[PDB]
Amino acid sequence: SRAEDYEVLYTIGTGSYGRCQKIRRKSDGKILVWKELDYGSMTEAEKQMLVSEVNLLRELKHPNIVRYYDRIIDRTNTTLYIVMEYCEGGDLASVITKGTKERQYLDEEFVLRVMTQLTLALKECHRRSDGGHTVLHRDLKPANVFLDGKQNVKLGDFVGTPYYMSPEQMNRMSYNEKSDIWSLGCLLYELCALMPPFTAFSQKELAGKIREGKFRRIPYRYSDELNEIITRMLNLKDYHRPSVEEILENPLILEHHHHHH
Ligand SMILES: NS(=O)(=O)c1ccc(Nc2nc(OCC3CCCCC3)c3nc[nH]c3n2)cc1
């Protein structure tokens, strides 16, 4: 309930909401992280915006969703502390970087686990169980996808260039569930090719490439089937993209893909 109940270990990275640090829970020694939100400049109706969102996401529970643990207010530091599961295996962006450095494509099996488990995660957001929510992730990219010790997927974190900008957002249309699917298509594509499906140096020529909807096949190392389903998420028409259910129906997706390395 208070900062005193936790001991900061060190500081990881600083993302959107603010700083993110690894921590030990005083009472039993569990390693975790939390995320700072300085609320010190917010109003009392800018705040009301945050608190409903924070509660919505707090109810989200899934083995491939980063687990919520605690919230903490600190008037002194005017900071809101959201405490969450620590993800030992880092993020997929590092995995992609590593593939690039080593010049080694990832196994189709590893891509199939990631696709399967992010799809289960998004399904719990989009549908799910019972349940009220309907949540869209709205920021699906490798830096927001973490791995545990057995490299299982944890979906987290609900001037640069927006490679994964969907065709809806780019044509003034509201972000919908199929926009999550486009983002997943970009991520899986980049996971295979070790580069995103549309590259460019200016945003206006990236927008142009995205509008035409054309890109390289993922490497030949990968099956026609995997290329097909990823390509399907990159349909320009959102109603031509698979839903999370259609994805999971794919013959490629098997039981062993749902858990551990
Ligand atoms: N770079 S790295 O490869 O060395 C490595 C990376 C991340 C982690 N672990 C980890 N990180 C998080 O966010 C850190 C990250 C989140 C997005 C914004 C910037 C900061 C988490 N949020 C919940 N659980 C989290 N777990 C371990 C090693």
Numbering used by the authors: 3 to 160, 177 to 279
Quote the study's own text.
Nek2 (NIMA-related kinase 2) is a human cell cycle-dependent serine/threonine protein kinase that localizes to the centrosome. However, Nek2 does play a key role in ensuring timely assembly of the mitotic spindle, a scaffold that is vital for accurate segregation of sister chromatids during mitosis. Phosphorylation of these proteins by Nek2 in late G2 promotes linker disassembly and loss of centrosome cohesion; this in turn allows the timely separation of centrosomes in prophase.
Preliminary data attained following a medium-throughput screening campaign, identified purines bearing 6-alkoxy substituents (e.g. 6; CDK2 IC50 = 0.005 μM; Nek2 IC50 = 12 μM) as dual inhibitors of Nek2 and CDK2. Interestingly, deletion of the sulfonamide moiety from 6, resulted in a 200-fold reduction in CDK2 inhibitor activity as well as some reduction in Nek2 activity (2-aminophenyl-6-(cyclohexylmethoxy)-9H-purine: CDK2 IC50 = 1 μM; Nek2 IC50 = 22 μM).
